[PDB]
């Protein structure tokens, strides 16, 4: 593979070169939320993000070295976590706000519109406040993104070992940019650490979070893309 | 297959 | 506090020392199993076990010095992935099997004795086949686990920079045992990676079990204790 | 909670 000849600054180079863009909401100012309304823009603006998803995926280097039921299964299984970090990265310069799109910042109280968000919305919050308190690079942020596309779904399958080399070859690099930031050697593996550990929590609000879709999608509140209900049956 | 379709393009 | 005292060994020797015993099940082999059946088993098992979790829990460095109520937000996140990693490392020697007992050892194929069981049997498993790849040390499992305890709740909140700090502590001991074991740096990095998305896998298996649980539950197949009940509505 | 009264003692 050629991924794994890149050195430490040629592959954050990749990753912050294939950054997807910070999409718009469908948002109207003049209409204040029901409950479909703000579920339609959310799962609206979902489905227009997964499509510069997969785009971004096969840009991940050793992403393409995977055959092809591989990608689909390591992207149906992160594609909410992978949402949800960027949703959480975009936050962080919004205190106690999540924007979802450049016109569409909603905070705790937004989220009671719909049922069982708020409890969500906190989780996606208390994640943004540690990104902060953290102060989260954006090169850490395209490294732990990339580790959540080929980690979260390889134990639920050589591929698995070519994995493994990517995955070492990210942690590589993690430790590379806090070596060059100044970090000593134990701040450097307390800080791998401490990044690491926020991905068990990112796989548990994207659990939380696709439970709440197949709610909203069998009490039928808002119809679904046909994509979209297709990543939502992949966890059922 | 609609998963599919997006990573052939 | 006096967990952040504690030199490396100390560390190790402390949470070594703290391990719960391994219990047996009141299962007997001349039975076949109903659905029912199982399901009491393995939840009978799971009760017994949080009782000496409880225990293990005031034991871990760090712990106890936490406040009554978020010493229960902790445990009430972690249970189940602190028994599914315990289950997890019991079973490394046994591959394609899961340990739940001594006398309690099942496959994949008993698993579909409960629906949807073998699922989460499948996801058990994969962990464990995982751990026996990496050729998991006890020193590094009791490690992992108590990292479970204070990180799997931490977010779901001083108390946070005192945990954060046992977590850091606990993150230089995992360093410190693979520098004795003659690993270079760059192989404790990678290795001390490797161990930590574990853990997302299994807060994973713990999410996916708990709804299987609150699902037996409300289909009265057969009932659970109290306390595994007062754990099941945390969730 | 009876996990309150086992963590009390
Ligand atoms: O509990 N559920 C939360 C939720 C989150 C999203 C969502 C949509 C777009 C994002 O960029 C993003 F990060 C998240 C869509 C639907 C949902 O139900
Ligand atoms: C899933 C599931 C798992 C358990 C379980 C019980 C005891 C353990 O040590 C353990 F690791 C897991 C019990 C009931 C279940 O439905």
């Given at each position: 593979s050629?991924?794994?000849?890149?050195?430490?600054?040629?592959?954050?180079?990749?990753?912050?070169?294939?950054?997807?863009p910070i999409l718009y909401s469908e948002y109207d100012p003049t209409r204040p939320f029901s409950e479909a309304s703000m579920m339609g823009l959310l799962t609206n603006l979902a489905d227009r993000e997964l499509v510069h998803m997969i785009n971004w995926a096969k840009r991940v280097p050793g992403f393409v070295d995977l055959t092809l039921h591989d990608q689909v299964h390591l992207?149906?299984?992160?594609?909410?976590?992978?949402?949800?970090?960027?949703?959480?990265?975009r936050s962080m310069e919004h205190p106690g706000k999540l924007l979802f799109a450049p016109n569409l910042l909603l905070?705790?109280?937004?989220?009671?519109?719909?049922?069982?968000?708020?409890?969500?919305?906190?989780?996606?919050?208390?994640?943004?406040?540690?990104?902060?308190?953290?102060?989260?690079?954006?090169?850490?942020?395209?490294?732990?993104?990339?580790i959540i596309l080929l980690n979260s779904g390889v134990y639920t399958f050589e591929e698995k070992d070519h994995i493994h080399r990517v995955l070492d070859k990210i942690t590589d690099t993690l430790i590379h940019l806090m070596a060059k930031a100044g970090l000593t050697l134990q701040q450097q593996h307390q800080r791998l650490a401490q990044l690491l550990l926020i991905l068990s929590?990112?796989?548990?609000?994207?659990?939380k979070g696709?439970?709440?879709?197949?709610?909203?999608?069998?009490?039928?509140?808002?119809?679904?893309?046909?994509?979209?209900?297709?990543?939502?049956?992949?966890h059922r | 297959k609609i998963l599919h379709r997006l990573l052939q393009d």
């Open positions: 050629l991924a794994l000849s890149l050195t430490a600054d040629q592959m954050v180079s990749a990753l912050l070169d294939a950054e997807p992207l149906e299984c992160a594609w909410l976590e992978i949402l949800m970090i960027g949703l959480v990265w905070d705790r109280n937004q989220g009671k519109c719909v049922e069982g968000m708020v409890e969500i919305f906190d989780m996606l919050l208390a994640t943004s406040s540690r990104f902060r308190m953290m102060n989260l690079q954006g090169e850490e942020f395209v490294c732990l993104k990339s929590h990112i796989r548990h609000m994207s659990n696709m439970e709440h879709l197949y709610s909203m999608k069998c009490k039928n509140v808002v119809p679904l893309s046909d994509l979209l209900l297709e990543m939502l049956d992949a | -």
